[PDB]
Short mmCIF file of N, CA and C in Angstrom, two decimals:
data_model
loop_
_atom_site.label_atom_id
_atom_site.label_comp_id
_atom_site.label_asym_id
_atom_site.label_seq_id
_atom_site.Cartn_x
_atom_site.Cartn_y
_atom_site.Cartn_z
N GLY A 492 0.85 -1.22 0.00
CA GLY A 492 0.00 0.00 0.00
C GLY A 492 0.86 1.24 0.00
N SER A 493 2.09 1.11 -0.50
CA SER A 493 3.00 2.23 -0.54
C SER A 493 2.27 3.52 -0.89
N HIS A 494 1.32 3.45 -1.82
CA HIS A 494 0.58 4.64 -2.22
C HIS A 494 -0.68 4.91 -1.40
N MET A 495 -1.17 3.90 -0.69
CA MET A 495 -2.37 4.09 0.12
C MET A 495 -2.19 3.62 1.56
N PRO A 496 -2.93 4.24 2.49
CA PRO A 496 -2.81 3.85 3.90
C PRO A 496 -3.53 2.56 4.27
N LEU A 497 -3.19 2.04 5.44
CA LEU A 497 -3.83 0.84 5.96
C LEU A 497 -4.95 1.40 6.83
N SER A 498 -6.18 1.18 6.38
CA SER A 498 -7.38 1.66 7.06
C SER A 498 -7.59 1.06 8.44
N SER A 499 -8.52 1.63 9.20
CA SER A 499 -8.80 1.12 10.53
C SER A 499 -9.30 -0.32 10.42
N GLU A 500 -10.14 -0.60 9.43
CA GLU A 500 -10.64 -1.96 9.28
C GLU A 500 -9.53 -2.93 8.89
N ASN A 501 -8.63 -2.51 8.01
CA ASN A 501 -7.53 -3.38 7.61
C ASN A 501 -6.52 -3.54 8.74
N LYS A 502 -6.43 -2.54 9.61
CA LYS A 502 -5.52 -2.64 10.76
C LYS A 502 -6.08 -3.69 11.71
N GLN A 503 -7.40 -3.67 11.88
CA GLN A 503 -8.05 -4.62 12.77
C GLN A 503 -7.92 -6.03 12.21
N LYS A 504 -7.96 -6.14 10.89
CA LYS A 504 -7.84 -7.44 10.24
C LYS A 504 -6.44 -8.00 10.47
N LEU A 505 -5.43 -7.13 10.35
CA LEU A 505 -4.04 -7.55 10.55
C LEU A 505 -3.80 -7.88 12.02
N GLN A 506 -4.43 -7.11 12.90
CA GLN A 506 -4.31 -7.34 14.34
C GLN A 506 -4.70 -8.78 14.64
N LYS A 507 -5.84 -9.22 14.10
CA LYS A 507 -6.31 -10.57 14.33
C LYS A 507 -5.41 -11.64 13.72
N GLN A 508 -4.73 -11.30 12.63
CA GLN A 508 -3.82 -12.26 12.00
C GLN A 508 -2.59 -12.45 12.89
N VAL A 509 -2.11 -11.37 13.51
CA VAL A 509 -0.96 -11.47 14.40
C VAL A 509 -1.41 -12.25 15.64
N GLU A 510 -2.61 -11.95 16.14
CA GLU A 510 -3.12 -12.67 17.30
C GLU A 510 -3.27 -14.15 16.95
N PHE A 511 -3.57 -14.43 15.68
CA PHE A 511 -3.73 -15.81 15.22
C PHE A 511 -2.45 -16.60 15.41
N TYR A 512 -1.34 -16.05 14.95
CA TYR A 512 -0.07 -16.74 15.07
C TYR A 512 0.34 -16.97 16.52
N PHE A 513 -0.06 -16.06 17.40
CA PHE A 513 0.28 -16.16 18.82
C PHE A 513 -0.80 -16.81 19.68
N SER A 514 -1.88 -17.29 19.07
CA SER A 514 -2.95 -17.90 19.85
C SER A 514 -2.47 -19.17 20.55
N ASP A 515 -3.13 -19.52 21.65
CA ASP A 515 -2.77 -20.72 22.40
C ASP A 515 -2.72 -21.96 21.51
N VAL A 516 -3.74 -22.11 20.67
CA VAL A 516 -3.82 -23.28 19.80
C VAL A 516 -2.69 -23.37 18.79
N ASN A 517 -2.44 -22.27 18.10
CA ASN A 517 -1.42 -22.23 17.07
C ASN A 517 0.02 -22.20 17.54
N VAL A 518 0.31 -21.35 18.52
CA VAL A 518 1.67 -21.22 19.02
C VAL A 518 2.24 -22.54 19.49
N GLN A 519 1.40 -23.36 20.11
CA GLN A 519 1.85 -24.64 20.62
C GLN A 519 2.22 -25.64 19.51
N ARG A 520 1.90 -25.31 18.27
CA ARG A 520 2.23 -26.20 17.16
C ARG A 520 3.33 -25.63 16.30
N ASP A 521 3.68 -24.38 16.57
CA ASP A 521 4.66 -23.64 15.79
C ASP A 521 6.07 -23.71 16.38
N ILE A 522 6.84 -24.70 15.94
CA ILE A 522 8.20 -24.90 16.42
C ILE A 522 9.08 -23.69 16.11
N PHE A 523 8.90 -23.12 14.92
CA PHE A 523 9.70 -21.97 14.55
C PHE A 523 9.38 -20.79 15.44
N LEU A 524 8.09 -20.47 15.59
CA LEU A 524 7.72 -19.33 16.41
C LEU A 524 8.12 -19.54 17.87
N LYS A 525 7.91 -20.74 18.40
CA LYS A 525 8.31 -20.99 19.78
C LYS A 525 9.82 -20.82 19.92
N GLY A 526 10.55 -21.14 18.86
CA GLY A 526 11.99 -21.00 18.89
C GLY A 526 12.39 -19.54 19.04
N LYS A 527 11.70 -18.66 18.33
CA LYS A 527 12.00 -17.23 18.40
C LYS A 527 11.65 -16.71 19.79
N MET A 528 10.50 -17.14 20.29
CA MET A 528 10.05 -16.71 21.61
C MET A 528 11.01 -17.13 22.70
N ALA A 529 11.69 -18.26 22.51
CA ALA A 529 12.62 -18.78 23.50
C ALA A 529 13.99 -18.11 23.46
N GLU A 530 14.19 -17.20 22.52
CA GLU A 530 15.47 -16.51 22.41
C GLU A 530 15.67 -15.52 23.55
N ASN A 531 14.57 -15.13 24.19
CA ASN A 531 14.65 -14.22 25.33
C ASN A 531 13.57 -14.64 26.34
N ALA A 532 13.79 -14.28 27.60
CA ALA A 532 12.88 -14.65 28.68
C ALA A 532 11.52 -13.98 28.68
N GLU A 533 11.34 -13.00 27.81
CA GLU A 533 10.08 -12.28 27.76
C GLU A 533 9.18 -12.79 26.64
N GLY A 534 9.73 -13.66 25.80
CA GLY A 534 8.98 -14.21 24.69
C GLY A 534 8.76 -13.22 23.56
N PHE A 535 9.60 -12.20 23.51
CA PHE A 535 9.50 -11.19 22.46
C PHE A 535 9.95 -11.74 21.10
N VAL A 536 9.20 -11.38 20.07
CA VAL A 536 9.49 -11.78 18.69
C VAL A 536 9.55 -10.50 17.86
N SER A 537 10.59 -10.33 17.06
CA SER A 537 10.73 -9.11 16.26
C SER A 537 9.63 -8.98 15.21
N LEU A 538 9.18 -7.75 15.00
CA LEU A 538 8.14 -7.51 14.01
C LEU A 538 8.68 -7.83 12.62
N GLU A 539 9.99 -7.72 12.42
CA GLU A 539 10.51 -8.06 11.09
C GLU A 539 10.31 -9.55 10.83
N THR A 540 10.30 -10.35 11.89
CA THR A 540 10.08 -11.78 11.71
C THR A 540 8.63 -11.98 11.30
N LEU A 541 7.74 -11.23 11.93
CA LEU A 541 6.32 -11.35 11.61
C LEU A 541 6.04 -11.00 10.15
N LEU A 542 6.82 -10.07 9.61
CA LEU A 542 6.65 -9.67 8.22
C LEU A 542 6.91 -10.81 7.23
N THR A 543 7.57 -11.87 7.70
CA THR A 543 7.87 -12.99 6.82
C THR A 543 6.76 -14.04 6.78
N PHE A 544 5.80 -13.92 7.68
CA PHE A 544 4.68 -14.86 7.74
C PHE A 544 3.63 -14.46 6.70
N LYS A 545 3.12 -15.46 5.99
CA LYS A 545 2.14 -15.27 4.92
C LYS A 545 0.96 -14.35 5.20
N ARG A 546 0.29 -14.55 6.33
CA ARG A 546 -0.88 -13.74 6.65
C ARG A 546 -0.56 -12.28 6.94
N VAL A 547 0.71 -12.00 7.23
CA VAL A 547 1.12 -10.63 7.49
C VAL A 547 1.66 -10.02 6.19
N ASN A 548 2.50 -10.80 5.52
CA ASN A 548 3.15 -10.42 4.26
C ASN A 548 2.16 -10.04 3.16
N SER A 549 0.98 -10.64 3.17
CA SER A 549 0.00 -10.32 2.15
C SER A 549 -0.65 -8.96 2.39
N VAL A 550 -0.54 -8.46 3.62
CA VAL A 550 -1.14 -7.19 4.01
C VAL A 550 -0.18 -6.00 4.06
N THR A 551 1.05 -6.24 4.51
CA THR A 551 2.01 -5.15 4.63
C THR A 551 3.45 -5.66 4.58
N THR A 552 4.38 -4.74 4.32
CA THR A 552 5.80 -5.09 4.28
C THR A 552 6.54 -4.05 5.12
N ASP A 553 5.78 -3.32 5.93
CA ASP A 553 6.32 -2.26 6.79
C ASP A 553 6.05 -2.49 8.27
N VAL A 554 7.12 -2.65 9.05
CA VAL A 554 7.00 -2.87 10.49
C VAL A 554 6.22 -1.76 11.18
N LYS A 555 6.28 -0.55 10.64
CA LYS A 555 5.57 0.57 11.26
C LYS A 555 4.06 0.43 11.15
N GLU A 556 3.59 -0.21 10.09
CA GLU A 556 2.15 -0.42 9.94
C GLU A 556 1.74 -1.56 10.88
N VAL A 557 2.64 -2.52 11.08
CA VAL A 557 2.34 -3.63 11.96
C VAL A 557 2.21 -3.12 13.39
N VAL A 558 3.00 -2.11 13.75
CA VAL A 558 2.93 -1.55 15.10
C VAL A 558 1.54 -0.94 15.34
N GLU A 559 1.05 -0.18 14.36
CA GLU A 559 -0.26 0.46 14.49
C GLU A 559 -1.38 -0.58 14.53
N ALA A 560 -1.23 -1.63 13.74
CA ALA A 560 -2.23 -2.68 13.70
C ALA A 560 -2.30 -3.46 15.02
N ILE A 561 -1.14 -3.68 15.62
CA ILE A 561 -1.05 -4.45 16.86
C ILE A 561 -1.42 -3.72 18.14
N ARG A 562 -1.04 -2.45 18.25
CA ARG A 562 -1.28 -1.69 19.48
C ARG A 562 -2.59 -1.91 20.24
N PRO A 563 -3.74 -1.85 19.56
CA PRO A 563 -5.04 -2.04 20.22
C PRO A 563 -5.27 -3.39 20.90
N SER A 564 -4.48 -4.39 20.52
CA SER A 564 -4.65 -5.73 21.07
C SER A 564 -4.51 -5.84 22.58
N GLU A 565 -5.31 -6.73 23.16
CA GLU A 565 -5.27 -6.97 24.60
C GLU A 565 -4.60 -8.32 24.84
N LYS A 566 -4.23 -8.99 23.75
CA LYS A 566 -3.58 -10.29 23.83
C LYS A 566 -2.10 -10.19 23.53
N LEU A 567 -1.68 -9.05 22.98
CA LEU A 567 -0.28 -8.83 22.62
C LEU A 567 0.26 -7.58 23.30
N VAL A 568 1.57 -7.54 23.49
CA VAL A 568 2.23 -6.39 24.11
C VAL A 568 3.46 -6.04 23.28
N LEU A 569 3.57 -4.76 22.90
CA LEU A 569 4.69 -4.27 22.11
C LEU A 569 5.85 -3.89 23.03
N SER A 570 7.07 -4.07 22.54
CA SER A 570 8.25 -3.73 23.33
C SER A 570 8.32 -2.21 23.43
N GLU A 571 9.03 -1.72 24.44
CA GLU A 571 9.16 -0.28 24.64
C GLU A 571 9.61 0.44 23.36
N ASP A 572 10.49 -0.19 22.58
CA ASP A 572 10.98 0.42 21.35
C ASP A 572 10.13 0.15 20.11
N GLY A 573 9.04 -0.59 20.29
CA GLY A 573 8.15 -0.89 19.18
C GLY A 573 8.74 -1.72 18.05
N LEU A 574 9.75 -2.53 18.35
CA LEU A 574 10.35 -3.36 17.31
C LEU A 574 10.01 -4.83 17.54
N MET A 575 9.41 -5.13 18.69
CA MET A 575 9.05 -6.51 19.01
C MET A 575 7.67 -6.63 19.65
N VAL A 576 7.15 -7.85 19.70
CA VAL A 576 5.85 -8.08 20.32
C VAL A 576 5.88 -9.43 21.03
N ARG A 577 5.12 -9.53 22.12
CA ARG A 577 5.05 -10.76 22.89
C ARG A 577 3.61 -11.05 23.29
N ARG A 578 3.35 -12.29 23.69
CA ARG A 578 2.03 -12.67 24.14
C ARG A 578 1.82 -12.02 25.50
N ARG A 579 0.58 -11.68 25.80
CA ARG A 579 0.24 -11.10 27.08
C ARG A 579 0.30 -12.23 28.10
N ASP A 580 -0.18 -13.40 27.67
CA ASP A 580 -0.23 -14.59 28.52
C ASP A 580 0.90 -15.59 28.31
N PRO A 581 1.28 -16.32 29.37
CA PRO A 581 2.35 -17.32 29.33
C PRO A 581 1.97 -18.50 28.45
N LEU A 582 2.97 -19.22 27.95
CA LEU A 582 2.68 -20.39 27.13
C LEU A 582 1.79 -21.30 27.96
N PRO A 583 0.81 -21.95 27.32
CA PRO A 583 -0.10 -22.85 28.04
C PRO A 583 0.61 -23.96 28.83
#
């Protein structure tokens, strides 16, 4: 969308896609994602990593748009510097 913005509705759609990858059901089956989460004790995963996932990549290629899409979430928490995101809740 280099030429057009990511609307509020599309931000909400992307928000749910990020929540999808981090959901209790999915995360427990994702060896790659769990591997990234285990790189630090807070379970933070870089937004650039998220940009490589299909459901995110089809919507945006800019970490800054991912930050705006994610912020409203009550299931995810952004790092102080806005370059990473983690689950609000501990692994099941």
